[PDB]
């Protein structure tokens, strides 16, 4: 039988990062991840502060921040702790294991030092996960595997998706879920996060495709919606975030019965 | 089979591909150094010393502890002096709207200094359309990852065929592939092959190695990409020369 987020947080094989997430989702009545796709640190932080109470997670693309510093990420962590959300760097690691370990720990971004969660493509084989684990496990972090993509012509289908699920289930000490369009694992210890979400039908001019929160959470059985432009391009980002939160949360409840 | 110099003149050749092919012929090198280091000073010292031996220097900018745009300016100076291209191995792999910003912007401003970048094809062709919005105006080229060297790679069969079709349909920007072998029969595309060492072996995190003779001679690729085989050696110049000579002779042999 289908379990609430709060009960899933207690499952025997739950990862600590997933448990923390699931608990705050239930506490705050939110399964919304804000995709904070902005180029200005000040806007990132103003969004994180104002929308923090409405979100379970803030997803970053640190490599698009024109004025990235590690101090910016310190300020973001303060907001994450204050408002209770996880930080997810959407880095899409996708190289051989030896390379991704350095890309995760080092360089200018030092992603592992501030990101609760990262994601990885499965195309290199399981070495990508083993490499990331060498950094992530000691730093008490989690990882999401990209099992499906939202964009037109995605090759993350069929056997590829099945491979991502197997890879996750075999690295459960580090991998806590998926980026996917629907439920892809039957194991309730895994999170499903779905991008390509807007209230209205449509897409963008570079292959993005949208589905609604009701469709993704209610019909397709995903856990969390990831929303960027549907919120960020709106005049009132707070009201937009609230609309998305209420949509995703009610769809979750209804599926739960 | 056409020489690199003849391929540089093909009707449908991309200007970046042509520049590369001409300097490969001129310098007798089809070696790409994978400069997998964390210090700018080591990067630049390798680029200067090994520049005459290489057709290309591949970077992972996001592992450089002391990256600045001025470091990349110095690398360009070396690239112009010694005549090699700069390839940032970023493996763009997101939706089109996102990758365009990751390519043009942020701290790294990759498009401002990288002649070549690469991309995974898993998102569908929007990844290439997004990149080309930035890269076409900046006269850049791109490589699509058709195959990977690592154990368990899913870049096989229909996935590889999709990479080839995507390249062939974006030939104004895509100049070739990262692959383990020749994957396109069209001589205007370059094939660059990582997972290369002289000796048999691998690493502890899924990397698998094949020799330059195997990759260039038997598998029909154009360029070898070599990191640790050179970088971990005491004398990196002599190591680079060993790889250069291996790859170049394998190419000549195939050419007949
Ligand atoms: C989250 C993720 O891994 C990813 C995968 C994918 O298939 N689709 C997608 O849009 N994304 C990302 O989500 C965000 C979608 O933003 P949008 O709502 O279209 O403005 C972007 O920041 C994408 O880079
Ligand atoms: C170049 C490329 O796209 C790539 C793809 C791949 O399938 N295998 C691979 O090793 N690479 C990269 O080449 C280099 C190989 O370095 P190595 O010679 O194993 O020390 C690394 O910097 C990898 O990130």
mmCIF file of C-alpha atoms and ligand atoms in Angstrom, chain A residues 94-96 98-100 102-103 124, chain B residues 32 34-36 58-60 63 87 89-91 118 120 145 147-150 153 178-179 192-197 203 207-209 225-232, ligand 2:
data_model
loop_
_atom_site.group_PDB
_atom_site.id
_atom_site.type_symbol
_atom_site.label_atom_id
_atom_site.label_comp_id
_atom_site.label_asym_id
_atom_site.label_seq_id
_atom_site.Cartn_x
_atom_site.Cartn_y
_atom_site.Cartn_z
ATOM 1 C CA UNK A 94 28.110 12.607 -17.077
ATOM 2 C CA UNK A 95 31.769 11.677 -17.357
ATOM 3 C CA UNK A 96 33.949 8.745 -16.386
ATOM 4 C CA UNK A 98 37.713 9.400 -12.212
ATOM 5 C CA UNK A 99 36.746 12.729 -13.750
ATOM 6 C CA UNK A 100 33.410 13.306 -11.990
ATOM 7 C CA UNK A 102 37.099 15.959 -9.149
ATOM 8 C CA UNK A 103 34.225 17.892 -10.742
ATOM 9 C CA UNK A 124 28.783 6.393 -18.747
ATOM 10 C CA UNK B 32 44.944 15.569 -28.159
ATOM 11 C CA UNK B 34 43.814 15.702 -21.904
ATOM 12 C CA UNK B 35 45.291 18.238 -19.503
ATOM 13 C CA UNK B 36 43.634 16.838 -16.418
ATOM 14 C CA UNK B 58 41.417 19.315 -23.900
ATOM 15 C CA UNK B 59 40.457 21.015 -20.661
ATOM 16 C CA UNK B 60 38.176 20.342 -17.730
ATOM 17 C CA UNK B 63 38.558 21.064 -11.966
ATOM 18 C CA UNK B 87 38.553 21.771 -26.482
ATOM 19 C CA UNK B 89 35.241 18.734 -22.257
ATOM 20 C CA UNK B 90 32.115 20.075 -20.587
ATOM 21 C CA UNK B 91 29.726 17.315 -21.820
ATOM 22 C CA UNK B 118 31.212 18.454 -26.566
ATOM 23 C CA UNK B 120 25.739 14.273 -24.850
ATOM 24 C CA UNK B 145 29.393 11.906 -27.704
ATOM 25 C CA UNK B 147 30.283 6.277 -27.653
ATOM 26 C CA UNK B 148 32.044 6.264 -24.266
ATOM 27 C CA UNK B 149 35.134 4.400 -23.139
ATOM 28 C CA UNK B 150 33.847 3.380 -19.719
ATOM 29 C CA UNK B 153 28.427 2.686 -21.218
ATOM 30 C CA UNK B 178 33.727 11.499 -29.282
ATOM 31 C CA UNK B 179 33.691 7.801 -30.085
ATOM 32 C CA UNK B 192 38.242 11.684 -31.377
ATOM 33 C CA UNK B 193 38.852 8.696 -29.125
ATOM 34 C CA UNK B 194 39.625 8.748 -25.413
ATOM 35 C CA UNK B 195 40.455 5.665 -23.343
ATOM 36 C CA UNK B 196 43.939 5.448 -24.885
ATOM 37 C CA UNK B 197 47.184 4.127 -23.407
ATOM 38 C CA UNK B 203 41.468 2.424 -13.904
ATOM 39 C CA UNK B 207 37.964 3.511 -17.534
ATOM 40 C CA UNK B 208 39.136 1.068 -20.180
ATOM 41 C CA UNK B 209 42.206 1.555 -22.378
ATOM 42 C CA UNK B 225 42.780 11.736 -26.476
ATOM 43 C CA UNK B 226 45.343 10.895 -23.764
ATOM 44 C CA UNK B 227 45.349 12.034 -20.125
ATOM 45 C CA UNK B 228 47.091 9.946 -17.457
ATOM 46 C CA UNK B 229 49.254 8.084 -20.004
ATOM 47 C CA UNK B 230 51.044 11.388 -20.443
ATOM 48 C CA UNK B 231 50.190 13.454 -17.336
ATOM 49 C CA UNK B 232 51.294 10.858 -14.739
HETATM 50 C C1 LIG C 2 37.050 13.116 -23.907
HETATM 51 C C2 LIG C 2 35.742 12.586 -23.471
HETATM 52 O O1 LIG C 2 34.653 13.092 -23.934
HETATM 53 C C3 LIG C 2 35.677 11.440 -22.522
HETATM 54 C C4 LIG C 2 34.637 10.517 -22.843
HETATM 55 C C5 LIG C 2 34.883 9.192 -22.624
HETATM 56 O O2 LIG C 2 34.066 8.350 -23.037
HETATM 57 N N1 LIG C 2 35.986 8.786 -21.985
HETATM 58 C C6 LIG C 2 36.915 9.635 -21.494
HETATM 59 O O3 LIG C 2 37.906 9.183 -20.886
HETATM 60 N N2 LIG C 2 36.754 11.011 -21.694
HETATM 61 C C7 LIG C 2 37.670 11.986 -21.068
HETATM 62 O O4 LIG C 2 38.984 11.801 -21.625
HETATM 63 C C8 LIG C 2 39.963 11.791 -20.565
HETATM 64 C C9 LIG C 2 40.589 10.402 -20.394
HETATM 65 O O5 LIG C 2 41.685 10.554 -19.509
HETATM 66 P P1 LIG C 2 42.687 9.329 -19.194
HETATM 67 O O6 LIG C 2 43.520 9.151 -20.433
HETATM 68 O O7 LIG C 2 41.831 8.116 -18.841
HETATM 69 O O8 LIG C 2 43.521 9.866 -18.065
HETATM 70 C C10 LIG C 2 39.258 12.275 -19.305
HETATM 71 O O9 LIG C 2 39.367 13.704 -19.131
HETATM 72 C C11 LIG C 2 37.822 11.880 -19.546
HETATM 73 O O10 LIG C 2 36.907 12.776 -18.921
#
